[PDB]
Short mmCIF file of C-alpha atoms (C1' of nucleotides) and ligand atoms in Angstrom, two decimals:
data_model
loop_
_atom_site.label_atom_id
_atom_site.label_comp_id
_atom_site.label_asym_id
_atom_site.label_seq_id
_atom_site.Cartn_x
_atom_site.Cartn_y
_atom_site.Cartn_z
CA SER S 1 42.00 -0.64 -9.49
CA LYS S 2 44.01 -1.73 -12.55
CA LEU S 3 42.20 -3.75 -15.23
CA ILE S 4 44.27 -6.03 -17.48
CA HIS S 5 42.65 -7.18 -20.73
CA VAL S 6 43.34 -10.61 -22.20
CA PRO S 7 41.53 -10.49 -25.58
CA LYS S 8 40.50 -13.54 -27.61
CA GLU S 9 43.34 -15.20 -29.53
CA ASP S 10 42.73 -17.41 -32.56
CA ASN S 11 46.29 -18.77 -32.56
CA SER S 12 46.32 -20.24 -29.05
CA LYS S 13 47.95 -23.48 -27.90
CA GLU S 14 45.20 -25.77 -26.62
CA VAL S 15 44.74 -26.68 -22.96
CA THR S 16 43.56 -30.09 -21.74
CA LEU S 17 43.06 -31.95 -18.47
CA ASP S 18 46.08 -34.10 -19.32
CA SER S 19 48.27 -31.05 -19.92
CA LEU S 20 47.07 -29.31 -16.76
CA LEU S 21 47.71 -32.59 -14.93
CA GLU S 22 51.22 -33.02 -16.33
CA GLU S 23 51.88 -29.31 -15.80
CA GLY S 24 51.06 -29.82 -12.11
CA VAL S 25 48.14 -27.39 -11.98
CA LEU S 26 45.49 -30.05 -11.32
CA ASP S 27 45.70 -32.92 -8.84
CA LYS S 28 44.78 -36.39 -10.14
CA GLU S 29 41.46 -36.61 -8.29
CA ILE S 30 39.73 -33.70 -10.08
CA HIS S 31 41.18 -34.74 -13.44
CA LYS S 32 39.71 -38.18 -12.82
CA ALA S 33 36.32 -36.57 -12.18
CA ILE S 34 36.23 -34.25 -15.20
CA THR S 35 37.59 -36.87 -17.61
CA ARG S 36 34.80 -39.33 -16.76
CA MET S 37 32.26 -36.74 -17.92
CA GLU S 38 33.60 -37.66 -21.37
CA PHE S 39 33.63 -34.18 -22.88
CA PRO S 40 35.38 -33.76 -26.24
CA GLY S 41 37.75 -31.18 -24.79
CA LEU S 42 37.77 -28.16 -22.49
CA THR S 43 35.71 -25.21 -23.74
CA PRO S 44 37.58 -21.94 -24.49
CA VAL S 45 36.68 -20.14 -21.25
CA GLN S 46 37.72 -23.22 -19.26
CA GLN S 47 41.04 -23.41 -21.09
CA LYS S 48 41.46 -19.70 -20.44
CA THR S 49 40.25 -19.48 -16.81
CA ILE S 50 41.50 -22.48 -14.81
CA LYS S 51 45.23 -21.74 -14.61
CA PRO S 52 44.85 -17.97 -13.98
CA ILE S 53 42.16 -18.43 -11.29
CA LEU S 54 44.65 -20.70 -9.50
CA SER S 55 47.78 -18.84 -10.64
CA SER S 56 48.50 -15.73 -8.57
CA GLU S 57 47.45 -15.29 -4.95
CA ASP S 58 46.78 -11.71 -6.09
CA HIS S 59 44.83 -10.65 -9.22
CA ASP S 60 41.01 -10.68 -9.23
CA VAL S 61 39.24 -12.28 -12.22
CA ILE S 62 36.56 -11.24 -14.69
CA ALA S 63 35.60 -13.71 -17.41
CA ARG S 64 33.25 -13.34 -20.38
CA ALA S 65 31.99 -16.32 -22.37
CA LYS S 66 28.82 -17.00 -24.34
CA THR S 67 25.84 -18.96 -23.03
CA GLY S 68 26.16 -22.71 -22.51
CA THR S 69 29.93 -22.81 -23.02
CA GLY S 70 30.74 -24.36 -19.64
CA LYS S 71 31.26 -21.25 -17.50
CA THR S 72 30.29 -23.26 -14.41
CA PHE S 73 33.07 -25.87 -14.36
CA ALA S 74 35.35 -23.05 -15.49
CA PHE S 75 35.29 -21.97 -11.84
CA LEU S 76 34.01 -25.13 -10.13
CA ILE S 77 37.14 -27.04 -11.19
CA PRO S 78 39.71 -24.48 -9.93
CA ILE S 79 37.81 -24.27 -6.65
CA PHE S 80 38.01 -28.03 -6.11
CA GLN S 81 41.69 -27.84 -7.06
CA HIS S 82 42.24 -25.11 -4.47
CA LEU S 83 40.36 -27.24 -1.96
CA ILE S 84 42.72 -30.12 -2.70
CA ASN S 85 45.66 -27.71 -2.43
CA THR S 86 44.70 -26.87 1.18
CA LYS S 87 42.99 -29.99 2.54
CA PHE S 88 44.95 -29.82 5.82
CA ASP S 89 44.19 -26.14 6.52
CA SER S 90 40.76 -25.29 7.97
CA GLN S 91 39.28 -28.61 6.88
CA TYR S 92 35.83 -27.83 8.33
CA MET S 93 35.42 -24.27 7.04
CA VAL S 94 33.91 -22.59 3.97
CA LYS S 95 36.70 -21.66 1.56
CA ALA S 96 34.58 -20.81 -1.48
CA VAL S 97 31.31 -18.87 -1.71
CA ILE S 98 29.30 -18.81 -4.95
CA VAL S 99 26.43 -16.39 -5.52
CA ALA S 100 23.67 -16.54 -8.15
CA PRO S 101 20.72 -14.24 -9.05
CA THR S 102 18.06 -16.98 -8.82
CA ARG S 103 17.46 -20.01 -6.60
CA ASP S 104 17.09 -22.63 -9.33
CA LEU S 105 20.45 -21.53 -10.72
CA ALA S 106 22.11 -21.87 -7.31
CA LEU S 107 20.55 -25.30 -6.85
CA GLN S 108 21.69 -26.19 -10.37
CA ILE S 109 25.27 -25.22 -9.52
CA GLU S 110 24.97 -27.31 -6.36
CA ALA S 111 23.79 -30.20 -8.54
CA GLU S 112 26.84 -29.67 -10.77
CA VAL S 113 29.08 -29.85 -7.70
CA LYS S 114 27.20 -33.05 -6.87
CA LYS S 115 27.93 -34.31 -10.39
CA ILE S 116 31.62 -33.66 -9.74
CA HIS S 117 31.15 -35.57 -6.48
CA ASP S 118 29.43 -38.37 -8.41
CA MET S 119 32.26 -38.71 -10.94
CA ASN S 120 34.70 -39.20 -8.04
CA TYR S 121 33.66 -40.36 -4.57
CA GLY S 122 37.07 -39.20 -3.36
CA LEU S 123 35.83 -35.62 -3.65
CA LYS S 124 32.75 -36.04 -1.44
CA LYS S 125 34.93 -35.08 1.54
CA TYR S 126 34.78 -31.54 0.14
CA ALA S 127 31.16 -31.12 1.19
CA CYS S 128 28.76 -28.60 -0.34
CA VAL S 129 25.67 -26.87 1.04
CA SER S 130 23.22 -24.61 -0.78
CA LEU S 131 21.73 -21.59 1.00
CA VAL S 132 18.78 -20.26 -1.01
CA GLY S 133 15.56 -18.47 -0.08
CA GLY S 134 12.21 -20.23 0.02
CA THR S 135 13.58 -23.18 2.01
CA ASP S 136 13.83 -24.11 5.69
CA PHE S 137 16.54 -22.09 7.44
CA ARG S 138 16.97 -24.52 10.34
CA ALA S 139 17.37 -27.49 7.99
CA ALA S 140 19.95 -25.62 5.91
CA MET S 141 21.88 -24.74 9.07
CA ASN S 142 21.54 -28.33 10.29
CA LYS S 143 23.07 -29.37 6.98
CA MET S 144 25.76 -26.72 7.46
CA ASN S 145 26.60 -28.09 10.91
CA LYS S 146 26.41 -31.71 9.75
CA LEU S 147 28.59 -31.53 6.64
CA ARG S 148 30.81 -28.55 7.47
CA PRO S 149 30.85 -27.55 3.77
CA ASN S 150 33.93 -26.22 2.00
CA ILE S 151 31.75 -24.82 -0.79
CA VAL S 152 28.63 -22.70 -0.32
CA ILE S 153 26.27 -21.76 -3.13
CA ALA S 154 23.66 -19.17 -2.18
CA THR S 155 21.34 -16.34 -3.10
CA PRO S 156 22.35 -12.96 -1.59
CA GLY S 157 19.45 -12.43 0.84
CA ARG S 158 19.48 -15.80 2.57
CA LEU S 159 23.28 -15.68 2.56
CA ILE S 160 23.11 -12.36 4.42
CA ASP S 161 20.55 -13.87 6.80
CA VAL S 162 23.03 -16.70 7.44
CA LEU S 163 26.10 -14.46 7.75
CA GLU S 164 24.52 -12.01 10.21
CA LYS S 165 23.88 -15.02 12.46
CA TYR S 166 26.79 -17.41 11.82
CA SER S 167 29.51 -15.44 10.00
CA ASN S 168 32.04 -16.50 12.67
CA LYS S 169 31.29 -20.22 12.63
CA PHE S 170 31.73 -21.11 8.94
CA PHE S 171 32.88 -18.06 6.98
CA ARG S 172 36.04 -16.87 8.77
CA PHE S 173 38.37 -18.48 6.21
CA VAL S 174 36.88 -17.82 2.76
CA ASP S 175 39.47 -17.57 -0.01
CA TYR S 176 37.25 -17.36 -3.10
CA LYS S 177 34.13 -15.35 -3.93
CA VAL S 178 32.18 -16.15 -7.10
CA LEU S 179 29.51 -13.98 -8.70
CA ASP S 180 27.85 -16.02 -11.44
CA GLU S 181 25.84 -13.84 -13.82
CA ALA S 182 27.92 -11.05 -12.32
CA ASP S 183 26.22 -8.20 -14.17
CA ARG S 184 22.76 -9.06 -12.81
CA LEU S 185 24.17 -9.28 -9.28
CA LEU S 186 25.52 -5.74 -9.74
CA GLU S 187 22.15 -4.31 -10.79
CA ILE S 188 20.00 -2.27 -8.44
CA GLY S 189 18.37 -4.39 -5.74
CA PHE S 190 21.33 -6.79 -5.73
CA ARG S 191 24.47 -4.65 -5.51
CA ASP S 192 23.84 -3.55 -1.91
CA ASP S 193 23.51 -7.17 -0.80
CA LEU S 194 26.69 -8.19 -2.62
CA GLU S 195 28.55 -5.22 -1.11
CA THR S 196 27.23 -6.27 2.30
CA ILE S 197 28.34 -9.89 1.81
CA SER S 198 31.73 -8.73 0.53
CA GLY S 199 32.12 -6.41 3.51
CA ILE S 200 31.20 -9.07 6.06
CA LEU S 201 33.40 -11.76 4.51
CA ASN S 202 36.32 -9.33 4.24
CA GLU S 203 35.81 -8.18 7.82
CA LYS S 204 35.58 -11.71 9.21
CA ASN S 205 38.50 -13.27 7.32
CA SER S 206 41.46 -14.25 9.49
CA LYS S 207 44.43 -13.70 7.16
CA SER S 208 43.49 -10.22 5.90
CA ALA S 209 40.64 -8.05 4.62
CA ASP S 210 42.05 -8.33 1.09
CA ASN S 211 42.57 -12.09 1.19
CA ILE S 212 39.49 -13.20 -0.75
CA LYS S 213 39.75 -13.59 -4.52
CA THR S 214 36.68 -12.45 -6.48
CA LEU S 215 35.53 -14.17 -9.69
CA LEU S 216 32.93 -12.58 -11.99
CA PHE S 217 31.23 -14.65 -14.70
CA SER S 218 28.57 -13.73 -17.26
CA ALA S 219 27.76 -14.00 -20.96
CA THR S 220 27.08 -10.26 -20.89
CA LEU S 221 29.48 -7.76 -19.34
CA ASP S 222 31.92 -5.00 -20.28
CA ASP S 223 34.30 -2.74 -18.33
CA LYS S 224 31.35 -0.86 -16.84
CA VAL S 225 30.95 -3.74 -14.38
CA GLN S 226 34.43 -3.18 -12.94
CA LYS S 227 33.25 0.30 -12.00
CA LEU S 228 30.27 -1.36 -10.32
CA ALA S 229 32.39 -4.17 -8.87
CA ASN S 230 35.05 -1.82 -7.45
CA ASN S 231 33.64 -2.05 -3.92
CA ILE S 232 33.65 -5.87 -3.85
CA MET S 233 37.06 -6.32 -5.50
CA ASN S 234 40.04 -6.59 -3.13
CA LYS S 235 43.15 -7.21 -5.23
CA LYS S 236 45.31 -4.53 -6.83
CA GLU S 237 44.82 -5.66 -10.44
CA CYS S 238 42.00 -7.43 -12.28
CA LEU S 239 42.34 -10.15 -14.92
CA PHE S 240 39.83 -9.67 -17.75
CA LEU S 241 39.50 -12.86 -19.79
CA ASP S 242 37.42 -12.54 -22.96
CA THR S 243 36.51 -15.39 -25.30
CA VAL S 244 34.72 -12.85 -27.50
CA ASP S 245 36.09 -10.17 -29.83
CA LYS S 246 35.33 -6.61 -28.73
CA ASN S 247 33.20 -5.89 -31.82
CA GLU S 248 31.71 -9.40 -31.97
CA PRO S 249 28.14 -9.68 -30.65
CA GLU S 250 27.59 -11.42 -27.30
CA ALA S 251 24.74 -13.50 -28.73
CA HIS S 252 25.65 -17.06 -29.71
CA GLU S 253 26.33 -17.50 -33.42
CA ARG S 254 24.75 -20.96 -33.71
CA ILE S 255 21.36 -19.60 -32.64
CA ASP S 256 19.00 -19.17 -35.60
CA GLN S 257 17.23 -15.93 -34.68
CA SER S 258 13.97 -14.58 -36.10
CA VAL S 259 11.30 -12.07 -35.08
CA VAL S 260 7.58 -12.03 -35.89
CA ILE S 261 6.01 -8.58 -35.97
CA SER S 262 2.28 -7.91 -35.51
CA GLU S 263 -0.02 -4.89 -35.61
CA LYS S 264 -1.10 -5.44 -32.01
CA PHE S 265 0.62 -6.92 -28.96
CA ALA S 266 -2.22 -9.39 -28.46
CA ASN S 267 -1.64 -10.77 -31.96
CA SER S 268 1.71 -12.14 -30.80
CA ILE S 269 -0.35 -14.59 -28.75
CA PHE S 270 -1.91 -15.86 -31.97
CA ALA S 271 1.44 -15.95 -33.76
CA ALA S 272 3.06 -18.04 -31.03
CA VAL S 273 0.22 -20.58 -31.02
CA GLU S 274 0.31 -20.91 -34.81
CA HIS S 275 4.10 -21.29 -34.68
CA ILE S 276 4.02 -23.96 -31.98
CA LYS S 277 1.19 -25.73 -33.81
CA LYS S 278 3.34 -25.81 -36.94
CA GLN S 279 6.30 -27.23 -35.02
CA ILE S 280 4.38 -30.05 -33.31
CA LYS S 281 3.10 -31.24 -36.69
CA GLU S 282 6.46 -30.91 -38.46
CA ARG S 283 8.37 -32.47 -35.55
CA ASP S 284 5.73 -35.10 -34.74
CA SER S 285 5.42 -34.00 -31.09
CA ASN S 286 9.22 -34.25 -30.79
CA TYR S 287 9.35 -30.66 -29.59
CA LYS S 288 11.12 -29.15 -26.58
CA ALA S 289 10.69 -25.39 -26.20
CA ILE S 290 10.89 -22.48 -23.77
CA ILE S 291 8.53 -19.50 -24.04
CA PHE S 292 9.12 -16.29 -22.10
CA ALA S 293 6.56 -13.72 -20.95
CA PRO S 294 6.79 -10.25 -19.33
CA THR S 295 4.79 -10.88 -16.14
CA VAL S 296 3.71 -13.65 -13.76
CA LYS S 297 0.05 -13.12 -14.64
CA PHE S 298 0.65 -13.11 -18.39
CA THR S 299 2.77 -16.23 -17.93
CA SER S 300 0.04 -18.00 -15.96
CA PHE S 301 -2.52 -16.75 -18.48
CA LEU S 302 -0.45 -17.87 -21.47
CA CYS S 303 -0.09 -21.21 -19.72
CA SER S 304 -3.89 -21.60 -19.71
CA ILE S 305 -4.06 -20.98 -23.45
CA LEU S 306 -1.14 -23.28 -24.26
CA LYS S 307 -2.59 -25.96 -21.97
CA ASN S 308 -5.98 -25.71 -23.67
CA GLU S 309 -4.24 -25.54 -27.06
CA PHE S 310 -1.42 -28.10 -26.74
CA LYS S 311 -1.90 -30.49 -23.80
CA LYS S 312 -3.00 -33.22 -26.24
CA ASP S 313 0.45 -33.14 -27.77
CA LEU S 314 2.88 -31.99 -25.08
CA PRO S 315 3.29 -31.20 -21.38
CA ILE S 316 2.98 -27.51 -20.44
CA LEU S 317 5.05 -26.47 -17.42
CA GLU S 318 4.31 -23.17 -15.65
CA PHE S 319 7.47 -21.68 -14.16
CA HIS S 320 7.74 -18.39 -12.27
CA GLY S 321 8.64 -16.83 -8.93
CA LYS S 322 5.22 -17.37 -7.36
CA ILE S 323 5.64 -21.13 -7.71
CA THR S 324 6.78 -22.84 -4.50
CA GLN S 325 10.42 -23.95 -4.47
CA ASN S 326 9.52 -27.64 -4.45
CA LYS S 327 7.36 -27.32 -7.57
CA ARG S 328 10.09 -25.22 -9.18
CA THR S 329 12.83 -27.75 -8.41
CA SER S 330 10.69 -30.71 -9.52
CA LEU S 331 9.48 -29.11 -12.76
CA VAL S 332 13.04 -27.98 -13.49
CA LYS S 333 14.20 -31.57 -13.02
CA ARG S 334 11.36 -32.84 -15.22
CA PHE S 335 12.10 -30.36 -18.00
CA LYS S 336 15.79 -31.23 -17.69
CA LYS S 337 14.96 -34.93 -18.06
CA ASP S 338 11.99 -34.85 -20.48
CA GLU S 339 12.65 -35.23 -24.20
CA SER S 340 9.85 -32.87 -25.22
CA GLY S 341 7.49 -30.25 -23.81
CA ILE S 342 6.90 -26.53 -23.41
CA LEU S 343 8.28 -24.46 -20.54
CA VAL S 344 6.28 -21.26 -20.05
CA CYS S 345 8.23 -18.89 -17.82
CA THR S 346 9.22 -15.42 -16.66
CA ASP S 347 12.85 -14.26 -16.52
CA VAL S 348 13.47 -16.61 -13.60
CA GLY S 349 14.62 -19.12 -16.22
CA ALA S 350 16.33 -16.53 -18.39
CA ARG S 351 19.82 -16.82 -16.90
CA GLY S 352 22.13 -19.79 -16.46
CA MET S 353 19.53 -22.56 -16.35
CA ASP S 354 20.80 -25.46 -18.47
CA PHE S 355 18.02 -27.49 -20.08
CA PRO S 356 19.61 -29.98 -22.49
CA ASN S 357 18.34 -30.28 -26.06
CA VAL S 358 15.90 -27.36 -26.26
CA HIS S 359 14.86 -26.92 -29.88
CA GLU S 360 13.36 -23.42 -29.78
CA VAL S 361 13.31 -20.36 -27.52
CA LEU S 362 10.15 -18.32 -28.06
CA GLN S 363 9.44 -14.88 -26.60
CA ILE S 364 6.13 -13.06 -26.33
CA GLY S 365 6.91 -9.45 -25.50
CA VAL S 366 10.30 -8.15 -24.39
CA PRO S 367 12.72 -9.14 -21.59
CA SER S 368 13.06 -7.28 -18.29
CA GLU S 369 16.40 -5.93 -19.50
CA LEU S 370 18.16 -5.72 -22.87
CA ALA S 371 20.97 -8.10 -21.89
CA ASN S 372 18.42 -10.74 -20.89
CA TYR S 373 17.57 -11.05 -24.58
CA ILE S 374 20.97 -12.68 -25.02
CA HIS S 375 20.49 -14.98 -22.05
CA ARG S 376 16.92 -15.91 -23.03
CA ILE S 377 17.84 -17.24 -26.47
CA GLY S 378 20.85 -18.68 -24.67
CA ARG S 379 18.66 -21.39 -23.17
CA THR S 380 19.08 -23.16 -26.53
CA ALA S 381 22.08 -24.01 -28.71
CA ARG S 382 23.87 -25.01 -25.50
CA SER S 383 26.80 -27.44 -25.31
CA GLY S 384 27.45 -27.56 -29.06
CA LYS S 385 23.86 -28.31 -30.08
CA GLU S 386 21.97 -26.34 -32.74
CA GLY S 387 19.06 -24.06 -31.85
CA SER S 388 16.46 -21.59 -33.10
CA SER S 389 14.91 -18.46 -31.58
CA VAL S 390 11.71 -16.56 -32.39
CA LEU S 391 10.76 -13.12 -31.03
CA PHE S 392 7.03 -12.32 -31.10
CA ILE S 393 6.31 -8.58 -30.94
CA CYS S 394 4.25 -5.75 -32.39
CA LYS S 395 5.38 -2.60 -34.19
CA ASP S 396 5.14 -0.42 -31.07
CA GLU S 397 7.87 -2.63 -29.56
CA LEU S 398 10.22 -2.31 -32.56
CA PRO S 399 12.34 0.37 -30.87
CA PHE S 400 13.58 -2.56 -28.76
CA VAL S 401 14.87 -4.47 -31.80
CA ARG S 402 16.66 -1.27 -32.79
CA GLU S 403 18.24 -0.90 -29.36
CA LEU S 404 19.42 -4.50 -29.75
CA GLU S 405 21.45 -3.31 -32.74
CA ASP S 406 22.72 -0.09 -31.17
CA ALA S 407 23.92 -1.38 -27.81
CA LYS S 408 24.73 -5.06 -28.41
CA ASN S 409 25.46 -5.19 -32.15
CA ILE S 410 22.73 -7.84 -32.53
CA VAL S 411 20.94 -8.07 -35.88
CA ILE S 412 18.05 -10.45 -36.58
CA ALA S 413 18.21 -11.05 -40.33
CA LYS S 414 14.94 -12.99 -40.38
CA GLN S 415 11.99 -10.62 -40.05
CA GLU S 416 8.39 -11.03 -41.19
CA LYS S 417 4.96 -9.55 -40.51
CA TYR S 418 1.92 -11.32 -39.07
CA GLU S 419 -1.85 -10.80 -39.09
CA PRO S 420 -4.15 -13.41 -37.51
CA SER S 421 -6.96 -15.23 -39.30
CA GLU S 422 -10.42 -15.07 -37.75
CA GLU S 423 -10.27 -18.83 -37.26
CA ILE S 424 -7.20 -18.84 -35.02
CA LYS S 425 -8.55 -15.83 -33.11
CA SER S 426 -11.83 -17.64 -32.49
CA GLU S 427 -9.99 -20.81 -31.52
CA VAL S 428 -7.72 -19.00 -29.06
CA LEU S 429 -10.42 -16.73 -27.60
CA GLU S 430 -12.44 -19.92 -27.14
CA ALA S 431 -9.51 -21.29 -25.12
CA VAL S 432 -9.81 -18.37 -22.69
CA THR S 433 -11.90 -19.16 -19.61
CA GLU S 434 -10.64 -16.26 -17.49
CA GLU S 435 -13.20 -13.81 -16.12
CA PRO S 436 -12.96 -10.15 -17.22
CA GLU S 437 -11.74 -9.16 -13.75
CA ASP S 438 -8.73 -11.46 -14.20
CA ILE S 439 -8.03 -10.28 -17.75
CA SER S 440 -8.00 -6.76 -16.33
CA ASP S 441 -5.23 -7.66 -13.87
CA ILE S 442 -3.36 -9.61 -16.55
CA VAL S 443 -3.26 -6.60 -18.90
CA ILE S 444 -2.65 -4.11 -16.07
CA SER S 445 0.44 -6.11 -15.12
CA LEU S 446 1.64 -5.75 -18.72
CA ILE S 447 0.96 -2.00 -18.60
CA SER S 448 2.96 -1.68 -15.37
CA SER S 449 5.72 -3.91 -16.74
CA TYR S 450 6.08 -2.12 -20.07
CA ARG S 451 5.86 1.25 -18.34
CA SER S 452 9.03 0.60 -16.32
CA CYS S 453 11.17 -0.16 -19.39
CA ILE S 454 10.09 2.73 -21.62
CA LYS S 455 13.22 4.79 -20.99
CA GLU S 456 15.38 1.70 -21.45
CA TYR S 457 13.93 0.44 -24.75
CA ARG S 458 13.21 3.84 -26.37
CA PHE S 459 9.43 3.26 -26.43
CA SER S 460 6.87 5.95 -27.21
CA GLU S 461 4.78 6.10 -24.03
CA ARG S 462 1.85 7.60 -25.96
CA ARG S 463 1.89 4.78 -28.52
CA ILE S 464 2.98 1.68 -26.60
CA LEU S 465 0.84 1.62 -23.45
CA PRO S 466 -2.55 2.02 -25.16
CA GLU S 467 -1.61 -0.84 -27.47
CA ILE S 468 -0.81 -3.01 -24.45
CA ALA S 469 -4.06 -1.81 -22.89
CA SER S 470 -6.28 -2.63 -25.90
CA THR S 471 -5.33 -6.27 -25.29
CA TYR S 472 -8.17 -6.25 -22.75
CA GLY S 473 -10.68 -5.35 -25.42
CA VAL S 474 -9.14 -7.79 -27.89
CA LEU S 475 -9.41 -10.67 -25.41
CA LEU S 476 -12.96 -9.69 -24.46
CA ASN S 477 -13.45 -9.42 -28.24
CA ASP S 478 -14.67 -5.81 -28.02
CA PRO S 479 -11.84 -3.72 -29.60
CA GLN S 480 -13.35 -0.29 -28.87
CA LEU S 481 -13.71 -1.25 -25.21
CA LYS S 482 -11.47 0.18 -22.47
CA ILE S 483 -10.33 -1.28 -19.15
CA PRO S 484 -12.84 -0.46 -16.36
CA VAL S 485 -11.21 0.98 -13.21
CA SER S 486 -11.88 3.30 -10.27
CA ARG S 487 -10.71 6.92 -10.28
CA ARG S 488 -8.68 6.41 -7.10
CA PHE S 489 -6.95 3.42 -8.69
CA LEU S 490 -6.09 5.39 -11.82
CA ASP S 491 -4.84 8.10 -9.47
CA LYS S 492 -2.69 5.46 -7.78
CA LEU S 493 -1.46 4.66 -11.29
CA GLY S 494 -0.75 8.38 -11.65
CA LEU S 495 -2.12 8.57 -15.20
CA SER S 496 -5.23 10.54 -14.24
CA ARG S 497 -3.83 13.81 -15.59
CA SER S 498 -2.62 12.13 -18.80
CA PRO S 499 -4.33 11.84 -22.20
CA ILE S 500 -2.91 8.32 -22.37
CA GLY S 501 -4.51 7.21 -19.10
CA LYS S 502 -7.75 8.60 -20.48
CA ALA S 503 -7.05 6.84 -23.79
CA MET S 504 -6.43 3.45 -22.14
CA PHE S 505 -8.83 3.45 -19.18
CA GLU S 506 -12.52 4.02 -18.48
CA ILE S 507 -13.39 5.34 -15.01
CA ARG S 508 -16.30 3.14 -13.92
CA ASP S 509 -16.62 3.53 -10.14
"C1'" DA B 1 -0.05 -2.00 -10.07
"C1'" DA B 2 5.58 -4.23 -12.66
"C1'" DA B 3 11.53 -10.65 -13.43
"C1'" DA B 4 13.76 -11.54 -9.15
"C1'" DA B 5 15.21 -11.64 -4.46
"C1'" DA B 6 14.29 -11.73 2.69
"C1'" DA B 7 10.34 -13.10 5.26
N1 ADP U 601 34.05 -29.05 -21.52
C1 ADP U 601 32.77 -29.29 -21.90
N2 ADP U 601 32.47 -29.91 -23.06
C2 ADP U 601 31.20 -30.15 -23.43
N3 ADP U 601 30.14 -29.79 -22.68
C3 ADP U 601 30.30 -29.16 -21.49
C4 ADP U 601 31.66 -28.87 -21.02
N4 ADP U 601 31.53 -28.25 -19.84
C5 ADP U 601 30.21 -28.14 -19.56
N5 ADP U 601 29.47 -28.69 -20.55
C6 ADP U 601 27.99 -28.77 -20.60
O1 ADP U 601 27.41 -27.48 -20.79
C7 ADP U 601 26.11 -27.47 -20.20
C8 ADP U 601 25.82 -26.10 -19.60
O2 ADP U 601 27.05 -25.40 -19.41
P1 ADP U 601 27.15 -24.16 -18.39
O3 ADP U 601 28.27 -24.44 -17.41
O4 ADP U 601 25.76 -23.84 -17.90
O5 ADP U 601 27.62 -22.98 -19.38
P2 ADP U 601 27.27 -21.44 -19.08
O6 ADP U 601 27.34 -21.34 -17.58
O7 ADP U 601 28.36 -20.70 -19.82
O8 ADP U 601 25.88 -21.24 -19.64
C9 ADP U 601 26.07 -28.59 -19.17
O9 ADP U 601 24.94 -29.44 -19.42
C10 ADP U 601 27.38 -29.34 -19.33
O10 ADP U 601 27.18 -30.76 -19.43
F1 BEF U 602 26.98 -20.27 -15.32
BE1 BEF U 602 25.82 -19.88 -16.28
F2 BEF U 602 24.90 -18.82 -15.66
F3 BEF U 602 25.02 -21.17 -16.56
MG1 MG U 603 25.12 -19.20 -19.58
#
DNA sequence: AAAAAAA
């Protein structure tokens, strides 16, 4: 369809709750709720989104705004407004459906809705139910029946599982569709589900198949999403709202970025520990940080080290997809509340998760996708606070830092090399209690992980994978050693006819 | 065998 740009404007008349109230856009009850949150003033994207999202019964909406700049309320407020605008029509039906790439994010958005509810008990009538995977279906549906929610937040899969069973009962009158972190939801493995959801909701709707308004939000998107969103967009023209200049980088300016480069990938483990150690001393245990890792196993493994190396000083929270949803929710709450501590996680906590007052965002290795570099370091410097970011890598990963400059215009001015002392190496290797068999899996996971993103990050397959592989030897403290595997397994890997596979592995059946 | 996400 037709895309209409609305570029960033420096000379723009401000927008406030009071103005939007006096202008008649916002009813008193939502104003009352948002004002009590005692924000200085509406963030750019909020000022730019609210009126348009409510404005025409036509145009779809895309909105780009940097991390932690209030993109949530930027659509949660208009929704509530729309709910107030139609309180006598279909008062027991879902009118707004919000979708998010992870469960914790969905639950977080739900919690935000609950905050809105908390700031004004008059808005509790507009009930809200979350539909995410890893929780009891029956209970969720019991909640659905009980409350008759006007707002649903969900993850695609469970939402499909709900729709295929109860599309007629709750979802026959949706008017708004919200894709938070829209770009991720349009990636492979998500897009089909979103297209399915879109199809079902459009098919089921009573007024028309083009009734629903679609809202796309993310810190990272371009026009190339609209080509990917074409099948889920209904309206004839799309409203692109951008709080960022076209040339300007998507990364947040207030983030103090740096990158530590090592000879080997394993070294980055030593660099991170030495860095954290320095911070705890200089900050007197007043340290709140998030550290990212490529895989679940490397996360869990890194957690062991950090626990052995820093549990005297701080709490170490392990956070990844293989954690049960209860533990995830609880630890998320704890890290949200706690003043200090270290959150060791995969990319489950890369997008959208708002942990207040995080000092530093560390990264061992590279993200699952280029864009997720922006989101990762986005976990800090949120809501007007300052923040720092450190990227721990080795030379064989440097083509990634280059691709950060080429694609996203992101330049890390602060670079420096790193080589570990024998002391720190001894200290860390002493902190490893994992058997060789486990180390094997841990490194293999990294091999598999880094293999998948070679084409994406411009890596040299012949140079990168053996480096990742030698980690095994480094951890077992025998550099010349190779990972012991069976021929059939290496054949499953498909590297049996490769010099690399021979260079990284030792067939020991 | 490799974030996440449907069991
Ligand atoms: N208008 C505002 N002024 C100041 N802080 C805000 C405002 N709106 C939201 N926030 C804060 O921003 C934090 C995270 O914002 P979020 O909605 O996650 O932004 P994004 O989705 O763009 O990352 C929340 O803790 C919230 O309290
Ligand atoms: F809305 Be964002 F993903 F916090
Ligand atoms: Mg964000």
